[PDB]
Amino acid sequence: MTRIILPGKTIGIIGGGQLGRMMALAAKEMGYKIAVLDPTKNSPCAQVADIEIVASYDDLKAIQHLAEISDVVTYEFENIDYRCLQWLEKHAYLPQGSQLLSKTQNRFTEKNAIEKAGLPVATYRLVQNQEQLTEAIAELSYPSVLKTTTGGYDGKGQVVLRSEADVDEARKLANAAECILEKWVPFEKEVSVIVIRSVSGETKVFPVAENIHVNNILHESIVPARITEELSQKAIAYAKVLADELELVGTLAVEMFATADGEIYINELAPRPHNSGHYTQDACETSQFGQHIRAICNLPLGETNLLKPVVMVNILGEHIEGVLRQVNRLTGCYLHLYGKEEAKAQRKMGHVNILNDNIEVALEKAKSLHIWDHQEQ
Amino acid sequence: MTRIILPGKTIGIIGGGQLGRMMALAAKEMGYKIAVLDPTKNSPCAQVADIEIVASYDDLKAIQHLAEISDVVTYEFENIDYRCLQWLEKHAYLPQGSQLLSKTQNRFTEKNAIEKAGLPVATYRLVQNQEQLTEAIAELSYPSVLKTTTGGYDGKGQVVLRSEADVDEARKLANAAECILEKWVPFEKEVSVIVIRSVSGETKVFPVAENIHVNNILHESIVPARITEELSQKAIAYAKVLADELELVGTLAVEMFATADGEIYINELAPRPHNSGHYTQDACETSQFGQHIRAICNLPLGETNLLKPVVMVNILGEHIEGVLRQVNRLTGCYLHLYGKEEAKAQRKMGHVNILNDNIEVALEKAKSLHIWDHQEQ
Numbered sequence A, B: 001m002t003r004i005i006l007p008g009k010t011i012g013i014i015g016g017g018q019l020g021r022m023m024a025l026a027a028k029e030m031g032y033k034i035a036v037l038d039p040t041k042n043s044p045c046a047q048v049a050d051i052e053i054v055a056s057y058d059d060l061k062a063i064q065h066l067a068e069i070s071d072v073v074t075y076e077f078e079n080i081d082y083r084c085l086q087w088l089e090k091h092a093y094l095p096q097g098s099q100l101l102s103k104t105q106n107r108f109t110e111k112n113a114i115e116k117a118g119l120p121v122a123t124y125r126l127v128q129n130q131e132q133l134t135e136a137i138a139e140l141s142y143p144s145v146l147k148t149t150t151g152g153y154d155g156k157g158q159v160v161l162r163s164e165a166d167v168d169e170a171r172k173l174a175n176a177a178e179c180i181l182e183k184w185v186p187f188e189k190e191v192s193v194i195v196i197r198s199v200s201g202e203t204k205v206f207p208v209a210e211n212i213h214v215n216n217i218l219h220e221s222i223v224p225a226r227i228t229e230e231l232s233q234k235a236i237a238y239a240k241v242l243a244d245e246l247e248l249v250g251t252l253a254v255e256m257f258a259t260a261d262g263e264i265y266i267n268e269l270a271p272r273p274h275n276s277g278h279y280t281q282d283a284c285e286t287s288q289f290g291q292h293i294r295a296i297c298n299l300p301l302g303e304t305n306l307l308k309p310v311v312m313v314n315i316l317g318e319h320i321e322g323v324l325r326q327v328n329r330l331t332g333c334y335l336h337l338y339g340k341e342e343a344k345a346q347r348k349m350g351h352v353n354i355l356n357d358n359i360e361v362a363l364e365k366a367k368s369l370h371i372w373d374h375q376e377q
């Protein structure tokens, strides 16, 4: 499309957490004005916004007020209900649309969409009752994973089935929610690729990141991912096909499992800037945030070249005190802090990008700081 | 010396122009709060700040207020009364001090300080009346340049004396303001170096940039500067010498003349982030703005490696319509706009950083856009 949102206009963001703040910082460099809607006052994004609307995400009047004063609307918060999404899509300017968001909100719908796009996923079965769970266990065997189809984004919303001894905890889960059961994928590495597609269809792909999770929370992203050139090219190709097939506008994070045998399976999609892309802020020619703004405003996309190898490390509530006390040791480290007040143990408070010519040296730097000893074990 | 301003604290900025705005954006990424004092409501920096104080720079009570709500204060406005800074360094925390600003604000005192350091400047004479102008011309001969000693570029401020035919114009200037006359330096290139020195003494220098001025306004900065390795090394050494001898805390921009025979003359010093350092936002590991914040807060400085060659081009009031009209054509270009509402022909509205593996391809890109046809002549 030809529709361009010029510098000087207002970008409205639904959700005022760190992803909102970082989008807003990127937009401000390019001379955009920012409006944000969020349930809590003084959110991370509001701390950088020109206009703040403090309301619930299901409050259609407030959503309308945001739209009314915005030249383009984007979201960080994903669980926007259909009546609000349709209103925005048809009566405001929401170039991302609602179709992609709706697909990624349900694990079953999501896997179907991926397979229909021609891409591999772990073999899976929908589980809506006990009978279906029984049949699924029979078909897929052990080991397996039962996950709820909606409302993550946790460790509680799933149960790993290694033996018949785990079935009872699984039945409990299938009793409270609609689920999916997936075959256990024996993977070597978890990897992700951020792809960007503008309103006019220009596409850019970021380099493959290797992701290390701990307690179902991201710990580290390592770029370049420590994988063969063949796995890398495959992950990138898969992401590009997804972006095309799903008619992406904006940002898509594609999380994947990579096997020793060089197989890729697609795990999940997030139609927004993602935690596994924060490395781009310091190590790439354009950040995922600068890219997202350009994409929705239909400006030319920037380059995604990796300019230096990087390890991103997450800063949770349990780490913030360690970071501040060790601040004098943060040479070659690039600190981002989100401006959150309460430091809950598993709340994401910031991240640090450790840049180095050698990836193993960056990894060692994080260890030597003794901030993440818990995650390291 | 050991004193550290931790992320989460409030940084106060005197002056709300583009330099304070970019300081503020970089500080926000680290989780700092920002206060700004500016005489005009909704200044570039206010659009990014948590707290805005609209008041004159000589309003001592507003200055005290800024001091009260801030954990550290810095300045962006280069023509601040040094008596205000004398108050701040004694009744608040101004790690930059008042000395450096007082020395660099007046061209004559500036020259004296550069010579005290042992570095070369163009031969110069103080001019307070017509008799002193006459004696200066007699002693220095032609060609020469007469410049006002204090901030008097809004614009004009200088007369180039190629022959006796220019003397009439110089007399006019000599009556209006205190001046110095300097010998014209026959240089092949103008270059600049940005040096950063933290509270605890840590010193970093950015790559040497080659600057192209049109009508005494910066037009392009070229990095790496197209000079010999030996000239780059000398420029870098001179910069460190100045930081050392001027007891620098914060940022110092050093503008220089490089002659055909490998000598460097120091033109002028600016005790702040400088227009010739804006390339660092997209081409270096740390920007001059992030480095300035880390310097005054006494955090470890970031690395200053050039990650990709770059041409920065200024966007003046005369250029902004052309930029907005040609946004479609800005591939490989990284646009920064300062949020100023009124365009005036020569007012600095933004800059664009053009990244390319080949510096000559970047330069051709700027020409092919035809936005700056007036400068290219």
Ligand SMILES: Nc1ncnc2c1ncn2[C@@H]1O[C@H](COP(=O)(O)OP(=O)(O)O)[C@@H](O)[C@H]1O
Binding pocket: A122, A145, A147, A152, A153, A154, A155, A182, A183, A184, A185, A186, A190, A213, A216, A267, A268
């Ligand atoms: N089919 C599978 N095979 C092996 N490991 C899996 C499988 N599904 C999930 N996991 C593991 O569980 C973690 C969480 O799974 P995921 O579906 O990403 O849940 P969430 O949405 O909570 O992040 C993943 O990081 C992965 O290590």
Ligand SMILES: Nc1ncnc2c1ncn2[C@@H]1O[C@H](COP(=O)(O)OP(=O)(O)O)[C@@H](O)[C@H]1O
Binding pocket: B122, B145, B147, B153, B157, B182, B183, B184, B185, B186, B190, B213, B216, B267, B268
């Ligand atoms: N002594 C000199 N010899 C040759 N060119 C000069 C000399 N002084 C200034 N110039 C030219 O004029 C420009 C403006 O002079 P400068 O002292 O930098 O004024 P300003 O403080 O307004 O930048 C310089 O960037 C340089 O190109």
